[PDB]
């Protein structure tokens, strides 16, 4: 049960609601497929990453939404999953 | 030569300036220090990304502004811990 | 003016991919908020156009099935040989 | 929303413990064509508002008179106490 990750839906999706996630140390997600709507959900940012180096994570993990389990598997949609390093750097004259 | 880094002078500040940055592996800097006028730059991420791994990167490196070489010293870059970091992905049920 | 105009993708193939490129076409997805990803197809030299003024990074719509959806360019793949946007990402706002 | 920012003059336990009296935390603001700016700010006024959205679209800090408009980059919470140690903010 180590694939087994609390999900928690959002409320806001505004401006700045995903920025609060990260803040937060969550990031949110999207959880869809057969005839039920999709769910927006907000997952532990570092507790989803230490697991996305295992082949497993891939083939299906375990989401709790409002205390129901969802089996899923990760979908291979955006190009670039992991973001850079790098953001912003200051440099000082010496 | 390997901590030599091309500095292009930023002209456009402002919403969306950065995030394009970005979309070209690029990303915003600013070099001050000395008695000097702070100037905005943009670097390689990758490139500097690459050497960061280097104790003498963090000694001295070399930013060349405008066709003149500017040795300077990057500022508080060790402050957070370095991860993997993702601010989205899909689910599909199964 | 960052309002454009977007087709959904129903074939998905590599071959309708390089079909697309081939008429003045590129590929793109779109993603994130509430609602499941979606292929689109949008106008290479209009996407093209707009992508020097910096607000096209900071908010545009795309009207995807008769409904204008903001985003942000998420992610832009050019061609190795070419001037040409092969594929980009857009993350819902 | 408006946050009263102190351009700190003096750094290190000392002048940490001043803040931790005056009920500040020790910030960063940077980006932008600026050099990088350490402040100081009001940990309960910042606190509280750190669960609204609104917060981490737009603030703006107030920097010797001058209206400075950020977002909230980066933020440090104690090891187990309920409060923020660091915080950075970057130029928009």
Do not use: W
């Not at 995903?18 to 907000?42: D, N």
């Amino acid at each position: 049960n180590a694939m087994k990750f609390e999900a928690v839906v959002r409320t806001e999706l505004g401006k700045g609601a995903s920025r609060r996630l990260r803040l937060a140390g969550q990031f949110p997600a999207v959880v869809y497929g057969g005839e039920a709507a999709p769910v927006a959900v907000a997952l532990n940012h570092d507790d989803i990453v230490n697991q996305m180096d295992k082949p497993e994570f891939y083939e299906a993990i375990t989401l709790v939404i409002g205390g129901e389990e969802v089996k899923v598997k990760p979908q291979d949609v955006q190009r670039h999953a992991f973001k850079p390093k790098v953001e912003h750097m200051d440099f000082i004259r010496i």
